[PDB]
Amino acid sequence: GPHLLREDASFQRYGQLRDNLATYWKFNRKAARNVFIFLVAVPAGLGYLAYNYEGKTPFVGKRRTEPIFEQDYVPRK
Amino acid sequence: AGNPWKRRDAWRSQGAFTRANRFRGALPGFFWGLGAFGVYCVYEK
Amino acid sequence: GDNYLILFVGWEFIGVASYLLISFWFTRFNAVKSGLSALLINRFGDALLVLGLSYLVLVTGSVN
Amino acid sequence: FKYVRGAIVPKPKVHPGYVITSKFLGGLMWFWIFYRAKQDYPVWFGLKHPWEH
Amino acid sequence: GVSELPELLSHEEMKQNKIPLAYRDRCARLLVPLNKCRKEGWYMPWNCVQERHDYEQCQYLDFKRRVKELEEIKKQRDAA
Amino acid sequence: KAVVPFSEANKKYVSSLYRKSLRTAHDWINKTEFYRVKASEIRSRFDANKHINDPNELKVIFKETEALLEDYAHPDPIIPPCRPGGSKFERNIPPRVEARIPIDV
Amino acid sequence: MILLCIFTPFLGSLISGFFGRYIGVNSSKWIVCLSIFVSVVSTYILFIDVIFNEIEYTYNIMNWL
Amino acid sequence: HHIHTPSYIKPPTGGWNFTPANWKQNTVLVLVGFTACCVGLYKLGEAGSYNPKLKYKEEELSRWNQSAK
Amino acid sequence: YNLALFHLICHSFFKALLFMSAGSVIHSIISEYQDIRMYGGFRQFIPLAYTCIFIASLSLMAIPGLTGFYSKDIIIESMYGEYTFSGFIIYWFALISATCTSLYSIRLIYYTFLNNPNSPKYIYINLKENDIVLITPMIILTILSIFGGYLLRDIYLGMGSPFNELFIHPNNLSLIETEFSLPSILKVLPLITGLGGGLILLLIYEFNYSLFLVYNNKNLSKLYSFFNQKIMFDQLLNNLILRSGLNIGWLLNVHID
Amino acid sequence: SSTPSLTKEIIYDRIVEILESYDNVKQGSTISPAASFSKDLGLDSLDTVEVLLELENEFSILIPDNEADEIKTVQQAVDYIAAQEDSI
Amino acid sequence: KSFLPHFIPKNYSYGDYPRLKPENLQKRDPYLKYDDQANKRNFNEPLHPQQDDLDMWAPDHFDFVQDSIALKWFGTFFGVLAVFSSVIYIGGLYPEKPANPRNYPFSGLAKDLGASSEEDTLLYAAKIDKSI
Numbered sequence A: 001g002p003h004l005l006r007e008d009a010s011f012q013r014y015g016q017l018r019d020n021l022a023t024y025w026k027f028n029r030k031a032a033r034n035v036f037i038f039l040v041a042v043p044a045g046l047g048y049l050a051y052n053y054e055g056k057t058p059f060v061g062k063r064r065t066e067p068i069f070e071q072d073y074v075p076r077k
Numbered sequence B: 001a002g003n004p005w006k007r008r009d010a011w012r013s014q015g016a017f018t019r020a021n022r023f024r025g026a027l028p029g030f031f032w033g034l035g036a037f038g039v040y041c042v043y044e045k
Numbered sequence C: 001g002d003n004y005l006i007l008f009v010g011w012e013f014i015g016v017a018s019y020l021l022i023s024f025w026f027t028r029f030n031a032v033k034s035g036l037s038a039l040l041i042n043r044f045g046d047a048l049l050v051l052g053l054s055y056l057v058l059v060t061g062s063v064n
Numbered sequence D: 001f002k003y004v005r006g007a008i009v010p011k012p013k014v015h016p017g018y019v020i021t022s023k024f025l026g027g028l029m030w031f032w033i034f035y036r037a038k039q040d041y042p043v044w045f046g047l048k049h050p051w052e053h
Numbered sequence E: 001g002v003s004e005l006p007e008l009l010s011h012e013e014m015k016q017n018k019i020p021l022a023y024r025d026r027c028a029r030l031l032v033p034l035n036k037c038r039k040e041g042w043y044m045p046w047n048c049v050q051e052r053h054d055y056e057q058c059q060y061l062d063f064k065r066r067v068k069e070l071e072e073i074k075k076q077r078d079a080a
Numbered sequence F: 001k002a003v004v005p006f007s008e009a010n011k012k013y014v015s016s017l018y019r020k021s022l023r024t025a026h027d028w029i030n031k032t033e034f035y036r037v038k039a040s041e042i043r044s045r046f047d048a049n050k051h052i053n054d055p056n057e058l059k060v061i062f063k064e065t066e067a068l069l070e071d072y073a074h075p076d077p078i079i080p081p082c083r084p085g086g087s088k089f090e091r092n093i094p095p096r097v098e099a100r101i102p103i104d105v
Numbered sequence G: 001m002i003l004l005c006i007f008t009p010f011l012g013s014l015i016s017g018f019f020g021r022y023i024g025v026n027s028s029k030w031i032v033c034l035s036i037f038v039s040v041v042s043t044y045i046l047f048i049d050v051i052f053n054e055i056e057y058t059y060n061i062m063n064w065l
Numbered sequence H: 001h002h003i004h005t006p007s008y009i010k011p012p013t014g015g016w017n018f019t020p021a022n023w024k025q026n027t028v029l030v031l032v033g034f035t036a037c038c039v040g041l042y043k044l045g046e047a048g049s050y051n052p053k054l055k056y057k058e059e060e061l062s063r064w065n066q067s068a069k
Numbered sequence I: 001y002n003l004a005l006f007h008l009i010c011h012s013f014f015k016a017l018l019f020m021s022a023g024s025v026i027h028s029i030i031s032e033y034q035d036i037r038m039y040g041g042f043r044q045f046i047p048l049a050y051t052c053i054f055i056a057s058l059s060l061m062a063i064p065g066l067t068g069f070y071s072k073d074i075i076i077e078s079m080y081g082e083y084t085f086s087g088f089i090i091y092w093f094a095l096i097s098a099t100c101t102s103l104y105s106i107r108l109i110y111y112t113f114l115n116n117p118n119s120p121k122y123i124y125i126n127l128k129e130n131d132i133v134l135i136t137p138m139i140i141l142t143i144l145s146i147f148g149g150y151l152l153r154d155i156y157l158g159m160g161s162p163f164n165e166l167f168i169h170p171n172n173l174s175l176i177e178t179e180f181s182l183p184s185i186l187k188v189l190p191l192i193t194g195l196g197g198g199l200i201l202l203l204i205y206e207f208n209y210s211l212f213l214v215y216n217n218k219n220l221s222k223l224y225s226f227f228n229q230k231i232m233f234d235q236l237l238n239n240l241i242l243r244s245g246l247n248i249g250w251l252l253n254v255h256i257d
Numbered sequence J: 001s002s003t004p005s006l007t008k009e010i011i012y013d014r015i016v017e018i019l020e021s022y023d024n025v026k027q028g029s030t031i032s033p034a035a036s037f038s039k040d041l042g043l044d045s046l047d048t049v050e051v052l053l054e055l056e057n058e059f060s061i062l063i064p065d066n067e068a069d070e071i072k073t074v075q076q077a078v079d080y081i082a083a084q085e086d087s088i
Numbered sequence K: 001k002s003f004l005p006h007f008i009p010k011n012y013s014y015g016d017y018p019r020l021k022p023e024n025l026q027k028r029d030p031y032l033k034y035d036d037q038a039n040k041r042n043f044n045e046p047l048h049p050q051q052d053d054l055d056m057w058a059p060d061h062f063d064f065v066q067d068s069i070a071l072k073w074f075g076t077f078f079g080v081l082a083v084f085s086s087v088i089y090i091g092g093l094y095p096e097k098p099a100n101p102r103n104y105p106f107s108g109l110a111k112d113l114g115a116s117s118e119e120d121t122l123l124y125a126a127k128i129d130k131s132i
């Protein structure tokens, strides 16, 4: 109605660019390094913890079967 | 001239800001702490 | 609190209360940013406290 | 109010309450320190055990 | 004073006195009256003086006993 | 730009160079009687190059001058509380005055 | 004497938060200080009973999980 | 002093040194309310509180283990 | 655990008092400065605020007789009292910080109460104390910063006091060796370095201030500019983790999203 | 009471002492508000930098280098500090 | 001296978006006149594509010393502490215990620490007094 927001010309170019980054993206050898890390390194990275330890962690009330405290003190002398 | 403001910073070492007045009783009532203690010393006898 | 979760209810609200108080003068840039820094680093601690509480339920079955 | 130029700061005369209130708190600290030190200085430094009397 | 370690409390006696777990040793007997003094005396420094120095004198003997039980252990290290 | 000796533009640059020359030394030396000496020493150093009309030596001395102020810069400069960078800066700034514009939302 | 020691500051905090506009400024600071003062007294009463007379308190309000 | 536009800004806390004209009238109106609430907390608190070390005597617990042994 | 809880209660009083008194120094001066390099010679002008700080500072320095002594010293006593390698290393770290506590405490008071004036002379003719409401809490905390540690010692640090709410395993009860096997030198060492170190620094600050202009020795200038920036951890956190962490979010936004 | 604000009467007095106390001002040089720091007072270009630095140090302010090059009469210094929030 | 924040590109080619090298607005002079005085930005100034990491709301950038200088000093600080710790551990210079560790009767309170049978005992017992 009364244009309560004092529109800034250079803000619009900023928002217009930030909403259209995908147009100017090019699949070079650097974008290929970041795609690999984020989609094939990390997902496979957690793809081994999620399977090397799946069904191998019986932690519910895991009792203690080992002494903790030393019984015989041997001085260095 | 050496230290051209000799007539402006003089009060930073005179009067209440002299070396004695600054350190004057920096320990609050040290002798008063002795003073009541001295009463208790001979009261202990 | 008599269980670890009630402690967590209080534990979080020190951060919410501090975030408001540290950034009390919200017109001062160094103070609005300082509230966010005090809120977020505590949440990093609270992120691990939640994880610890879970292992308490896993191993023992309760947080009392 | 006025500002007499080129005058040193005279020795202040704070309200009589503040000086007595300050010294009394300080006097207590020294009195308490001396009162305790007269009864526990060997024990503090280990010269005499508490049960030697 | 307390010139030697007093009679050791039996395990049935320690349970009934709610003695702390780490303070169950040769000096346990002297601790028992001291705790009763603290409760009515409000743990104050000036109230429980005789018993506290009586208790704390026992612990030094226990500490000295352990020293007397160290060179005994240490001699065996010099056996070979 | 082109350092023109005795020009007004160079007067300001020395005025700026000397303004930061005493402030930086003020921050390291917090006793007035010792601070007065340092100001005189620097003032006894802005007289050695006071009478120099050669631009070739002016750039090299001006390059050195900034390096000295940049080397001896105090990591924790003293700022007045209400000035920017202080402690009271933008504390309870009075609200901006502007008439309300009603809207039917 | 337990429920008073815990939730009294919460009552004082809310009074100035929402009723603060209606109770001025000076009359809003001292009410908040009043709410805390109640809790200070109630704590010492508990401290007397808990540390010295070995009494413990517990007020279970309602279940949560 | 200055103008802070408190004419339309009406938060729950007033803002900018706000004190209503009838602040004395509402002041006791809250003390009456607040004092009643604390009395409620003392009535609720004492009624429901309990000592967790006295609900079960020692003899009753000394037999629970013999049941679960 | 009993020692730490007791020292927690004590520290809540001789550290709350410091802030309030410091918050009164900043309020008393009409320029409302916070840098200690714009202070000096305030002892006569605001002697009540000085007295609260001085009593708090001595308690913070664990001077014998005060609340700090009954809580702070015994913790440091027991660093050597465990007689382990790790326990011994931390003892020196505590002992340095036990002395450092005595060194920067004197620095704060000297820079603000025993130094030649730095602020404009117009400030001093208006440098006074505050009202009674601002003064009442500081006096109440001042008393608790002297006597409270002595009265509450035996509740927590007493021998055999029943405190089963905090569990101490029987093999970990080393309180006996701490209070008996420490040589006399250790029981006074934090005080001897604290009192000697403070006075030595106090003379250097007063009569020999030419040494403490660190801009001469580049090694002492780099050292000063290192600890003054807080071990650069603020710079390492901002420029290398938050800045890096935000960049990961930018990479996902650009190369993935 | 606290500082009763800061009126130009008190402002001008504090500036005068700074000029009175500076021995680099040529002997004589009667100090009046309309007097210029160059002609009437005989302060060289580098002296004027020091005078303002003491002036900004006396009022606990920090005059920007861009604006401190424009203060050239004593009345300018009196007029400047008057309309300043951070003057104490 | 006044290095830009890390991870700031040098060349960006975003179609027809104007090319302007990044300027960190946090280091702008507060004393100059600005339309957006809090953010120190004049009206209608062009913005860098990654301007979110340069304006005031971005994390504060400390440019007092070189980052590799900071890592050098920060690592140097703990190198001395590691040196001090490592030297002691090598020769065992730290004091030895003056007495035997605290001992207890009843096989070191084995039963009192939840040892059901004589088989467990050492699984729960503390140090055991051998002078019963």
Ligand SMILES: CCCCCCCCCCCCCCCCCC(=O)OC[C@H](COP(=O)(O)OCCN)OC(=O)CCCCCCCCCCCCCCCCC
Pocket (backbone or CB within 6 Å): C009, G061, G062, G063
């Ligand atoms: C923001 C806008 C405002 C709107 C939201 C305001 C906040 C909401 C506050 C109320 C929240 C709703 C929950 C109250 C409903 C009562 C819940 C309840 O049913 O209690 C169950 C309790 C035990 O269950 P049972 O034995 O099965 O008997 C019930 C059979 N009908 O049976 C009972 O004996 C009833 C017990 C009633 C207890 C009173 C309720 C106390 C609520 C306040 C305390 C909340 C918990 C503490 C959290 C404070 C922070 C730590």
Ligand SMILES: CCCCCCCCCCCC(=O)OC[C@H](COP(=O)(O)OCC[N+](C)(C)C)OC(=O)CCCCCCCCCCC
Pocket (backbone or CB within 6 Å): C013, C016, G013, G014, G017, G018, H009, H011, H012, H013, H014, H015, H016
């Ligand atoms: C255990 C959980 C307890 C929760 C209850 C807490 C009660 C306190 C509520 C008081 C609200 C108040 O005061 O908000 C209203 C006040 C009003 O402005 P003003 O600051 O008075 O100044 C007035 C001058 N203005 C107009 C320039 C600001 O603030 C504000 O608008 C500030 C915005 C942030 C408010 C954040 C509220 C968070 C509430 C709690 C989130 C979980």
